């Protein structure tokens, strides 16, 4: 690790070097500064009407809430363990503040204590067969907290409903709020109460003295894609000025690479965010703030070879850099 003469000996594994050329290593050009850039957004996402709401919706008659064009403070509800059930499988929960997503899909409702575990992508249950189940491409996780002291009433909280029976199987992201009766037997009941035809809508018997399996839980599922489109909403990041003529690591709303940033001199479209070549690599980057288009050209190229004579004669050596203009070196 001192001179290129002895550095060849750690590759050839010998103390006597024959004359010729030997390939040892390659170049590694260090970047200096990090470039991050995000569009100007100052709104706050409506989190007060989701978690801090008095009443919720039902799992049978749910309504998906859309939230966009804001910034999300994910350091107060994901850091504090003020919730009963919180596990996360597909997203790392510690770094939601710098990765950016387009839109979040939230469903505010309540279920019992035996029903918060049977909601999973690909796993069946009493919710996953008749009420709600998740597809395979779900990227996100759930927030659940026990609410037996406030949601449960003495005579029974009859503001909420849930389904028991369904004639068919669910397909993902669908709502069925029909009041069609179930036919279990061979007799046609045709919507009339009778034998082998039961009413699927059932209210909640919310009482504070019940078991832990029937305790109410204020739950909300959150669905969002991760780097599938130009993003709108992410956490409180900071901006950095644009530096040119130096290859650095840039972060333009998730598009991470390493290379120089020169001006573009080709035709472009107002609905084009990046350009690619035949080798499927990023060639141009759109600026989220200014109306400028940059070019991508990487650095840290070339190989290193050592030209040496025999060690029996002398020890003066030289070094040849393969295929790199040494004006930068």
């Amino acid at each position: 690790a001192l001179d290129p003469l002895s550095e060849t000996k750690c590759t050839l594994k010998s103390f006597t070097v024959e004359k010729g050329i030997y390939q040892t290593s390659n170049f590694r050009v260090q970047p200096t500064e990090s470039i991050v850039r995000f569009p100007n957004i100052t709104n706050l996402c409506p989190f007060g009407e989701v978690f801090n709401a008095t009443r919720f919706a039902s799992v049978y008659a749910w309504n998906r809430k859309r939230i966009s064009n804001c910034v999300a403070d994910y350091s107060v509800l994901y850091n504090s363990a003020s919730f009963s059930t919180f596990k996360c499988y597909g997203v790392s929960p510690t770094k939601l503040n710098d990765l950016c997503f387009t839109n979040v899909y939230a469903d505010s409702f309540v279920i019992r204590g035996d029903e918060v575990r049977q909601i999973a992508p690909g796993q069946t249950g009493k919710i996953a067969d008749y009420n709600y189940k998740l597809p395979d491409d779900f990227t996100g996780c759930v927030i659940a907290w026990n609410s037996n002291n406030l949601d449960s009433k003495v005579g029974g909280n009859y503001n909420y409903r849930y389904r028991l029976f369904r004639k068919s199987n669910l397909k993902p992201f669908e709502r069925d709020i029909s009041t069609e009766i179930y036919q279990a037997g061979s007799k046609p009941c045709n919507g009339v109460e009778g034998f082998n035809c039961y009413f699927p809508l059932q209210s909640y018997g919310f009482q504070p003295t019940n078991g832990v399996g029937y305790q109410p839980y204020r739950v909300v599922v959150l669905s969002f894609e991760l780097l599938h489109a130009p993003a709108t909403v992410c956490g409180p990041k900071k901006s950095t000025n644009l530096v040119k003529n130096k290859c650095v690591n840039f972060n333009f709303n998730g598009l991470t690479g390493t290379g120089v940033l020169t001006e573009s001199n080709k035709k472009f479209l107002p609905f084009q965010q990046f350009g690619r070549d035949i080798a499927d690599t990023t060639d141009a980057v759109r600026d989220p703030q200014t109306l400028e288009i940059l070019d991508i050209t990487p650095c840290s190229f070339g190989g290193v070879s050592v030209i040496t004579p025999g060690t029996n004669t002398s020890n003066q050596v030289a070094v040849l850099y393969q295929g790199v203009n040494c004006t930068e070196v």
């Binding site: 080798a279 690599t281 990487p298 190229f301 070339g302 190989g303 393969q322 295929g323």
Partner: peptide, 22 residues
């Protein structure tokens, strides 16, 4: 007679001017 992810092309030892002299 008639790409930067580690690929490189080494130049030959005998150039086009020295082949035509042979």
């Amino acid at each position: 007679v008639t790409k930067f992810n580690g690929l490189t092309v080494l130049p030959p030892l005998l150039t086009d001017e020295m082949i035509a002299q042979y």
